[PDB]
Structure 1
Amino acid sequence: AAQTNAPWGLARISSTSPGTSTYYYDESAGQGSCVYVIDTGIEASHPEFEGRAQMVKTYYYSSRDGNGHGTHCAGTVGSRTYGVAKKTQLFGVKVLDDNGSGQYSTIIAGMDFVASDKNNRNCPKGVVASLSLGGGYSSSVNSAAARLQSSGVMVAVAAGNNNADARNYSPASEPSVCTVGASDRYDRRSSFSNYGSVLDIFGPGTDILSTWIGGSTRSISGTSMATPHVAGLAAYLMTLGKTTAASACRYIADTANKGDLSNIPFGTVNLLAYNNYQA
């Protein structure tokens, strides 16, 4: 399948070169997979989600996304226009309030919620969780992310936007999950992207167009935007039967575009997420 005039990041993940504008992907499109977006919520009524999104949990007075961030990330996973995996099922877990903030205890509860809740969902092709959030190093946050991964969920987490080593942030620093840095449309490391040995992969993160609340769209930047590209890619590859939740991060690294990014510090992987789709 070909989507013309796609957002640059979608075009990038199906290309061996920067500078193109068509997204190419297998029409299976993540059907039969599930992606949990653990964030500020998802505006499931957005026409871009086509009835494939729903809220499954909140820790606050509403399950509504009163911020937009979670809706944007969900859109990059699985919206019809802005998404990588255009037929996946999207499940929202609101661990962040409408200001984008959340206690680590709530975030941990949300991760253990997903590990159990997947047993209440139909995801025959597999389960992914996208965590576009983080704070300072916490062994308990890392352990929760490790449990979620161990339970059979492909966990993708943001590296963080500190232009620093991700070793000092959580859940970025948990080795067993898929830690995602950000790149721009010219194949530069995004100015704000964290780096370091713990990164597994980069995805598009600067100037990413996606869904927003009030049935709208906008472009924003972050490792938060790179993460759902990788989560969606995992769901897509799992639907194709090419990899599994336990092995998808490694598979994505194996099959990445290699050595093509600039301003990657010595000791950080130079790997850009790539679907290797050939018509």
Structure 2
Amino acid sequence: AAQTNAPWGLARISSTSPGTSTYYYDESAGQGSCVYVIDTGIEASHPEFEGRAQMVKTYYYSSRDGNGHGTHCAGTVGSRTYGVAKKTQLFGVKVLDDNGSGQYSTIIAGMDFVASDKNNRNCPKGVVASLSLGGGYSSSVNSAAARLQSSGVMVAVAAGNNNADARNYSPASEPSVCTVGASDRYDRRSSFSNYGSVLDIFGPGTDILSTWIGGSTRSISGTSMATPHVAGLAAYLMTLGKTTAASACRYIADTANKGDLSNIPFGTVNLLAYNNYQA
């Protein structure tokens, strides 16, 4: 399948070259997979989600996304226009308040929630969790991410936006999950992207158009935007049967575009997520 005039990041993940605008992908489109977006919530009524999104958990007075961040990330995973995996099922877990903040204890609870809650959902092709959040190093936060991954969920986490070594941030620094840095449309490391040996992969993160609250759209930047590209890619590849939750991060690294990014610090992987789709 081909989506013309796609957001640059979708085009990038199906291309061996920057500078194109059509997204190419197998029509299975992540059908039968599920992606949990652990964030500020999801505006599930947005026409872009086509009834495939739902809130399953909140730790606050509402499950609605009063911020937009979680809706934007969910849109990059799986919205019809802005999403990588256009037929996946999206489940929202609101661990961040409407200012985008959350306590680590709440975030940990939300990760353990997903590890159990997947047993209440139908995801025959597999389960992914997208965590566009983080703060300073916490062994307890890393352990929660490691548990979620061990339970059979492909965990993708943002590297962080400090232009610093991600070893000092959590859950970015957890070795067993997939830690995602950000790139721009010219294949440069995004100016804010964290780096370091704990990163596994880069995805598009600068000037990413996606869904927003109020039934709207907007373009924003962050490792928060790169992470759902990788989460959606994992769901798509799991639906194709090419990999599993336990092996998807390694598979994505194996099949990435290699050595094509600029301003990658020595010791950080130079790998850009790629779907390897041949029409």
Alpha-carbon distance between aligned partners in 2 of 1:123 and 1:264, rounded to the nearest angstrom? 36
Which consecutive residues of structure 1, in runs of 5 or more, have no partner in the other structure?
Answer: none
Alpha-carbon distance between aligned partners in 2 of 1:21 and 1:174, rounded to the nearest angstrom? 34
* 1:126-147 deviations in Å (ceiling 9; x for gaps): 0000000000000000000000
* 1:9-55 deviations in Å (ceiling 9; x for gaps): 00000000000000000000000000000000000000000000000
Q: Give the secondary structure class of the aligned counterpart of 1:251.
A: helix
> Superposition RMSD on alpha carbons, in Å?
0.1
Alpha-carbon distance between aligned partners in 1 of 2:7 and 2:36, rounded to the nearest angstrom? 22
Q: Give the secondary structure class of the aligned counterpart of 1:64.
A: coil
Moved over 3 A (4+): none
> How big is the shift at 1:201?
0.1
* 1:178-226 deviations in Å (ceiling 9; x for gaps): 0000000000000000000000000000000000000000000000000
> How big is the shift at 1:236?
0.0
Aligned partner of 2:259 in structure 1 is 259
TM-score after normalising by structure 2: 1.00
* 1:88-133 deviations in Å (ceiling 9; x for gaps): 0000000000000000000000000000000000000000000000
Alpha-carbon distance between aligned partners in 2 of 1:92 and 1:248, rounded to the nearest angstrom? 21
Identity of aligned residues (%): 100
> How big is the shift at 1:241?
0.1
Q: Give the secondary structure class of the aligned counterpart of 2:263.
A: coil
Alpha-carbon distance between aligned partners in 1 of 2:256 and 2:101, rounded to the nearest angstrom? 33
* 1:145-167 deviations in Å (ceiling 9; x for gaps): 00000000000000000000000
* 1:47-92 deviations in Å (ceiling 9; x for gaps): 0000000000000000000000000000000000000000000000
Q: Give the secondary structure class of the aligned counterpart of 1:91.
A: strand
Alpha-carbon distance between aligned partners in 2 of 1:109 and 1:2, rounded to the nearest angstrom? 39
Which consecutive residues of structure 2, in runs of 5 or more, have no partner in the other structure?
Answer: none
> How big is the shift at 1:174?
0.1
Alpha-carbon distance between aligned partners in 1 of 2:45 and 2:151, rounded to the nearest angstrom? 30
Alpha-carbon distance between aligned partners in 2 of 1:89 and 1:136, rounded to the nearest angstrom? 31
> How big is the shift at 1:248?
0.1
Q: Give the secondary structure class of the aligned counterpart of 2:107.
A: helix
Alpha-carbon distance between aligned partners in 2 of 1:202 and 1:139, rounded to the nearest angstrom? 24
* 1:233-261 deviations in Å (ceiling 9; x for gaps): 00000000000000000000000000000
> How big is the shift at 1:4?
0.1
Alpha-carbon distance between aligned partners in 2 of 1:183 and 1:273, rounded to the nearest angstrom? 10
Alpha-carbon distance between aligned partners in 2 of 1:60 and 1:197, rounded to the nearest angstrom? 35
TM-score after normalising by structure 1: 1.00
Q: Give the secondary structure class of the aligned counterpart of 1:85.
A: coil
